[PDB]
Design a protein around this ligand. Structure first.
Ligand code: ATP
Ligand code: ATP
Ligand code: ADP
Ligand code: MG
Ligand code: MG
Ligand code: MG
Lengths: 47, 469, 188, 501, 486
């Protein structure tokens, strides 16, 4: 047996869930910031 | 000739003859049955005995019944009259509208086109699905496979392909359902009738359904594939026209053979499959082909037992397809639908010469970025994502955006998702993925791309999320 | 099922199983001697080159076999038991091993009348006086009713003495065995 | 190549010309009984899968029709059969009684009452081995079968005519799902809407009789026996009985289906019918396959589950729902028989044995539980609430391993999850389910403590069932939640919330 | 009736006739059925004969008459086959007429002994940088190509076949190499597109495509490799050089397994009979390199194996890995991250080694191998990249460039001198000051530039077969001048 790439997600163990949760956290934060920036740009561009 | 049944064991009936002996593959009619029972010969055991597989339940058979050799293999009606009907494995209709009155009969067993009869042209077949068109483009006249576990999207995807292509097709079509739910067969029949593809009143139907659903004894599930294949063979050769042939499932064609094998007196192979798995499948998959005198755009759903692509059955089928779109359960768990696995679906026309330089560069870029993301997830396991460098957080963000953008809402999935089905022409997909890769959308949230058609719709959805924020 | 009368000696395999069937059939009705006669007559009949070659070809309908055998058993006016047995063998397809069947029956008949077989192996022939006294002594081994059925044999492998077999019992007085026993015992 | 019937006891009959005295057409003699399988010589006119009757009252089913003998399987213990016993035909393919007389009887796999309340007075009999409906008789599953379990009715809706599959490890609550479903239909059956009555059948395959007796007591307690049949082929029963019990139950249900009535049938378990079938096949010397299961153990279940159909209105409009129960070993849902059945059904309820300890009961593992029929078989009000609830749970399930917005999301998800828990043998009407789901999903519990929702729900239900039954009746009859009904629910939820603390 | 030169079918079914008679039939002899069907007599038992039918058993009723042809299986040979498409027995299937070959050979002949051979020393140019530098293949070798699905094995084989066109179009006679491509268990349209592809590159005037496709009966797929190997032994035994490509050898094993399990031979592991080693060993041991006393010819072999899930401990993969002189792993993980051909150079080996490399490619690849070996043991850091000393930083900055030099495109093999020039530029260090993404472009440019102007230097490298210090200096000057203006 050998090691592949991205096998932590495949295994589905605790570590895989920890991946998916942490990544979702980070990109939820960034999506909130990007949505705020999009609204603010919209207001700054109506003018 | 006329023999007499001598033994019945499961679906395997041994019949003894005193006149001449019926060659293998012949069809023998059992005398004294309320409904036509046809036994297909499969062996000559010596002493003028033949082993046979019963195409229909062998309940109520008695040792000594009389059996008449029809004299030729299972013959089925063909012609443009079978369009809009539904047929047994043995050709008799099962939609309760009277007999299929044709001039042409065809034997379901026939040799495959010789090597001197094959075509060598390949032209992409736009399907309107982003992932399929981008990473594993289909081809007109080619054989196509949908490898799925259970409940991943094989049937919804093949219904989407029917709706898309069969409706916009100049030629005819055929849907041979081999050993899958009868609920689905009825659903498809009614969907076609209500969508105009089938027409009960007049002769304007473009589909010739054939059904061997999973309540048929194994002798029947192992042959309805050949029956649908015979109808498509006729439309390819005699009509001299393009044809479509959807098969769902093509695993059951192997499973049924495995079911009867042991009783046929054969030592089992690797995983309980019959020793003749490879050839019993080649002799079938070698008739589903384009030739100089026609063209068949066969699509086939393929069960992958327990999501094990190394199983003998899918492993053997992989070599008989010009394009495979491996649906995956892991992607379907993320909610991406269709679940097509971008790093496992391949094709034979994915070349810079056949699809063009830019299409090829974009497809390879998508694959490479997704693979890089797969590698990075391992590090994100331990570090967390705040620790990732700034050239990789970009890679992860872009890869997530591309994963979402590969999803799409189909017109046959409105019942589940509620959204509206979309078709994305090839240019829209290539342009959208070019832009996502280039970085022209780092300012939109990833969820902006989830279940949208062209890229402009992702922009509009991002704007709507921002406004409603 | 019926209570088939057990034959004296038990044989096994298909041969001995047909033979047991026939023996139990004949024993009822007390037709053993005549049944054996018709059996040893079919033994000669089936060796006929035409029949021998016809019955070994598997490409003649088994019904042809049965019809031919019915003809050849009606011509000889065989007892109904033997005709039925031969028809049975033809139906089942075992007539290819008929000589094993009838032979078994012969054995199963010998043990009936007490022909306890024997065998003597020597390095040379035996003078009729010596052979006769040998028979007289061997007769002492048996029981009442039984009668010796001697079978002389010659082999050069054993040098001296001889080897005697009386049904199951077996005594090896060869010089070979004695030489081996002496050599082993003295070496060990 | 020694034939079985080439014994001496037979060749002797043949030799001395005595076979003509006995009947070898409608009668035979047991060559060899052993381990529950008889070989019979004779019966030249016995049909395949026909029933035969031994000379001691025991019955059997002639499975193997070999050239010279017949492999019969005894529906009982072969302690009483002896070499040479006379087996006499019965003339008819094995069939079982059916009717409304069976309702409320603990019948046996073969249709013989084992509750001791007297003979079944049935009139008609059906062959167990009948073909399932075709493409034409059926129609799309449209009506809802109310399970009475919040999670199932909300996120895994089950229609009438649909074959679900309750799959999970041992001791995770599959029979509990089945019995909640059986008990729930009590409200519909005790009513006048004859088109909503559902008649239940429980097939107990390879379960100790104590279990079946406790289950029957539980059903009688809720007086859910006047409309229930129980086909009981328990562990002590010969393998052929355990192999035939599902087909007896399925035919008893095909009766109600073919007469415009709606039936539900629950096989428990099918993984033990498969074991009984394997034993039968191996004792008939049929070659094994995977794990020794006969080569055709898929067809065995496919031909059984394909009979759960939903007939069109030209065929009476009847219906037969099936709820097979499979038992995986260690969550290894990728085994042989679980995989065989997972692709035969349309939907599956995944009982996970670690959701079961972490607190979630019933253990339904949403996200892995699917219903291919889907929202098409749901009530409009439940559609409305479930549309939001399923989505919110889907989002919360990817941020469970832990901001303000996402913190609110997790809070709401935990609120919903505590709302999906349930008692046992206490199903709820659809109106109450939608009421509490609405209360929890609009946000009227975003502040209440988690450990209190478990009680709040309970209390809340009582309040409505004691104060605003008119609203529930309106929601139920109207089917959908009307705007005035929505406002009434809003008022009621806020009022109870304020006065609950 | 004759039951020595003739017999009659007792039974048939699943392609295994059981014949009665044929008392004088030899084992592995070709009998003929009354229906114009041939067959091979494999099981000689006391009572019958087990004939495997070369075709469909629909035409073989019970009671048929079978007549022995008196000869072991044999196939045509010669240069009359070149450019044709024959089936597992020499019958043409390209519809260009009769093959017209005078000679014949037995498929089951034995390999050359211990003395006839001589150590593999010539280089068999595959035209692929990765193969030709890091896992070289000599003439007379047996280099397994083992991989997963759709990783690029058939493409390695076809690039090898296409490359030989430069040698076969020249006048040097001991560099000419004739290719044979045995295609076992492949959809016919695949073979048709392959023949078209070979015609496009004009590489079909010295190629013999032996076709045993999926529809063909099991015996034809079991027999195709031996037919091809005999047509190749013909060129070996006449002072010519051959290259036979079995594709795959796993499907020959599957066909053989079907034959055995239907003849009822003891199964064994994975149901493979006990001869799936003997089967392949007595095939791959016919790739030799005869010494001058025997002509000097040679016969390379490139068996292709598919491994399920990269499992190379399965039965057949290990059987064929313990028989061959190397292996070229083709991992898909590398395939999708840009590395195409996806030749995993850690697992790939060649027990022949650099004994079969031209002196120039030895001179360069000797150090390239070490550079990549050093890179492969600090590859993990690549992500972190910073935070590490200049030592590992330079290691994995050289490794990335070297890796990106080994990328190559469909059907475009490179002449040995051009590979040497590119690897020289890359490894001597004239690229470490370049952004990795541009490396490929540089290559695709530099190559062309060198091809246009400095053809004389390439000719000198090709002929001398070595990088003389004069040529070394001239090449350094060329690289420096070009890299300056980029
Ligand atoms: N919703 C629930 N709440 C609390 N307990 C439950 C619930 N459902 C099931 N249980 C508990 O699970 C136990 C066994 O469950 P059940 O017998 O229904 O599962 P099962 O898998 O059918 O068991 P087996 O497979 O052994 O027959 C019961 O004693 C019951 O207390
Ligand atoms: N050197 C390469 N550069 C770019 N693409 C390649 C290269 N080699 C192979 N490919 C691509 O990989 C795909 C599969 O190639 P190939 O047919 O050689 O693999 P295979 O192992 O033969 O497939 P199968 O196992 O199905 O026969 C092809 O579409 C081809 O475009
Ligand atoms: N495109 C899609 N959009 C939303 N849901 C889907 C989609 N495809 C499949 N699904 C869900 O996955 C399930 C898979 O069922 P289906 O694909 O019909 O059968 P199969 O097991 O043959 O794949 C469907 O019932 C559906 O709920
Ligand atoms: Mg499906
Ligand atoms: Mg239980
Ligand atoms: Mg290939």
């Amino acid at each position: 047996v050998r090691s592949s790439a991205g096998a932590v997600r495949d295994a589905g163990g605790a570590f895989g869930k920890r991946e998916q949760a942490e990544e979702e956290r980070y990109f939820r934060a960034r999506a909130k910031e990007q949505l705020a920036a999009l609204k603010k740009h919209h207001e700054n561009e109506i003018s | 000739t006329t023999g007499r049944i001598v033994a019945v064991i499961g679906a395997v009936v041994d019949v003894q003859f005193d006149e001449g002996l019926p060659p293998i593959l012949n069809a023998l009619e059992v005398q004294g049955r309320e409904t036509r029972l046809v036994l297909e010969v499969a062996q000559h055991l010596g002493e003028s005995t033949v082993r046979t597989i019963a195409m229909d339940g062998t309940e109520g058979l008695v040792r000594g019944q009389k059996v008449l050799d029809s004299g030729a293999p299972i013959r089925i009606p063909v012609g443009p009259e079978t369009l809009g009907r539904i047929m047994n494995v043995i050709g008799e209709p099962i939609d309760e509208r009277g007999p299929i009155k044709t001039k042409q009969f065809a034997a379901i067993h026939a040799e495959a086109p010789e090597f001197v009869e094959m075509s060598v042209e390949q032209e992409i077949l736009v399907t309107g699905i982003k992932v399929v068109d981008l990473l594993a483009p289909y081809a007109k006249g080619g054989k196509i496979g949908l490898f799925g576990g259970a409940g991943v999207g094989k049937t919804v995807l093949i219904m989407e392909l029917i709706n898309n292509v069969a409706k916009a097709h100049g030629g005819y079509s055929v849907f041979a359902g081999v050993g899958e739910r009868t609920r689905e067969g009825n659903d498809l029949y009614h969907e076609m009738i209500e969508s105009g593809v089938i027409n009960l009143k007049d002769a304007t139907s473009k589909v010739a359904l054939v059904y061997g659903q999973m309540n048929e004894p194994p002798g029947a599930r192992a042959r309805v594939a050949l029956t649908g294949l015979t109808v498509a063979e006729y439309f390819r050769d005699q009509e001299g026209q393009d044809v479509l042939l959807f098969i769902d499932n093509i695993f059951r064609f192997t499973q049924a053979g495995s079911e009867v094998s042991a009783l046929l007196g054969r030592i089992p192979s690797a995983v309980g499959y019959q020793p003749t798995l490879a050839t019993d499948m080649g002799t079938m998959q070698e008739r589903i082909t384009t030739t100089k005198k026609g063209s068949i755009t066969s699509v086939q759903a393929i069960y992958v037992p327990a999501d094990d692509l190394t199983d003998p059955a899918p492993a053997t089928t992989f070599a008989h397809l010009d394009a495979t779109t491996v649906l995956s359960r892991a992607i379907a768990e993320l909610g991406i639908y269709p679940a097509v696995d971008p790093l496992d679906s391949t094709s034979r026309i994915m070349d810079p010469n056949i699809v063009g330089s830019e299409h090829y560069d974009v497809a390879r870029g998508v694959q490479k970025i997704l693979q890089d993301y797969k590698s990075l997830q391992d590090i994100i396991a331990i570090l967390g994502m705040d620790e990732l460098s700034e050239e990789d957080k970009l890679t992860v963000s872009r890869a997530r955006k591309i994963q979402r953008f590969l999803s799409q809402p189909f017109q046959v999935a409105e019942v589940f998702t509620g959204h509206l089905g979309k078709l994305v022409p090839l240019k829209e997909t290539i342009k959208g993925f070019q832009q996502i890769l280039a970085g022209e959308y780092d300012h939109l949230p990833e969820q902006a791309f989830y279940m949208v058609g062209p890229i402009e719709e992702a922009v509009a959805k991002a704007d709507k999320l921002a406004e409603e924020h | 099922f019926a209570k088939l009368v057990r034959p004296p000696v038990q044989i096994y395999g298909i041969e001995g199983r047909y033979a047991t069937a026939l023996y139990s059939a004949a024993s009822k009705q007390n037709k053993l001697e005549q049944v054996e006669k018709e059996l040893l007559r079919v033994g000669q009949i089936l060796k006929e080159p035409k029949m021998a070659a016809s019955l070994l070809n598997p490409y003649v309908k088994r019904s042809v076999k049965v019809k031919s055998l019915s003809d050849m058993t009606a011509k000889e006016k065989f007892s109904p038991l033997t005709s039925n047995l031969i028809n049975l063998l033809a139906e089942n397809g075992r007539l290819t091993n008929t000589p094993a069947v009838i032979s078994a029956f012969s054995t199963m008949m010998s043990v009936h009348r007490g022909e306890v077989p024997c065998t003597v192996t020597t390095a040379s022939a035996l003078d009729e006086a010596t052979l006769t006294e040998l028979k007289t002594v061997l007769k002492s081994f048996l029981s009442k009713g039984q009668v010796l059925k001697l079978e002389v044999k010659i082999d050069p492998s054993i040098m001296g003495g001889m080897i005697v077999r009386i049904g199951e019992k077996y005594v090896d007085m060869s010089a070979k065995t004695k030489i081996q026993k002496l050599s082993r015992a003295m070496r060990e | 190549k020694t034939g079985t019937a080439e014994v001496s006891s037979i060749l002797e009959e043949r030799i001395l010309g005595a076979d003509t005295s006995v009947d070898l057409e409608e009668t035979g003699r047991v060559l060899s009984i052993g381990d529950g399988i008889a070989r019979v010589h004779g019966l030249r006119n016995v049909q395949a899968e026909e029933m035969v009757e031994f000379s001691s009252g025991l019955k059997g089913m002639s499975l193997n029709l070999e050239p010279d003998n017949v492999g019969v399987v005894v529906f009982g213990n072969d302690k009483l059969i002896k070499e040479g016993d006379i087996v006499k035909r019965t003339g008819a393919i094995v069939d079982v009684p059916v009717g409304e007389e069976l309702l409320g009887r603990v019948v046996d796999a073969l249709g013989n009452a084992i509750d001791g309340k007297g003979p079944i007075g049935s009139k008609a009999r059906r062959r167990v081995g009948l073909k399932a409906p075709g493409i034409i008789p059926r129609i799309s599953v449209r009506e809802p079968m109310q399970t009475g379990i919040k999670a199932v009715d909300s996120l895994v809706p089950i229609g009438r005519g649909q074959r679900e599959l309750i799959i999970g490890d041992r001791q995770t609550g599959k029979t509990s799902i089945a019995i909640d479903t059986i008990i729930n239909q009590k409200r519909f059956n005790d009513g006048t809407d004859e088109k909503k009555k559902l008649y239940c059948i429980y097939v107990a395959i390879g379960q100790k009789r104590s279990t079946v007796a406790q289950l029957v007591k539980r059903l009688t307690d809720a007086d859910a026996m006047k409309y229930t049949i129980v086909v009981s082929a328990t562990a002590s029963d010969a393998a052929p009985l355990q192999y035939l019990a599902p087909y007896s139950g399925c035919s008893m249900g095909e009766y109600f289906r073919d007469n415009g009535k709606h039936a539900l049938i629950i096989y428990d378990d099918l993984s033990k019918q498969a074991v009984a079938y394997r034993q039968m096949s191996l004792l008939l010397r049929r070659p094994p396959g995977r794990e020794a299961y006969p080569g055709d153990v898929f067809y065995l279940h496919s031909r059984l589950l394909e009979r759960a159909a939903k007939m069109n209105d030209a065929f009476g409009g009847g219906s037969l729902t099936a709820l097979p129960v499979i038992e995986t070993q260690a969550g290894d849902v990728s085994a042989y028989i679980p995989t065989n059945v997972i692709s035969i059904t349309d939907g599956q309820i995944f009982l996970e044995t670690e959701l079961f300890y972490k607190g979630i009961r019933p253990a339904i593992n949403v996200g892995l539980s699917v219903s291919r029929v889907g929202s098409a078989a749901q009530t409009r009000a439940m559609k409305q609430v479930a549309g939001t609830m399923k989505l919110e749970l889907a989002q919360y399930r990817e941020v469970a391993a832990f901001d303000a917005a996402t913190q609110q999301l997790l809070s709401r998800g935990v609120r919903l999850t505590e709302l999906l828990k349930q008692g046992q043998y206490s199903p709820m009407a659809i109106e109450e389910q939608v009421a509490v789901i609405y209360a929890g999903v609009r946000g009227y519990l975003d502040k209440l403590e988690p450990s209190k929702i478990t009680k709040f729900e309970n209390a809340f239900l009582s309040h409505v069932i004691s104060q605003h039954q008119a609203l529930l009746g309106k929601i139920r009859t109207d089917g959908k939640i009307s705007e005035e009904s929505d406002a009434k629910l809003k008022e009621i939820v806020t009022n109870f919330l304020a006065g609950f603390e």
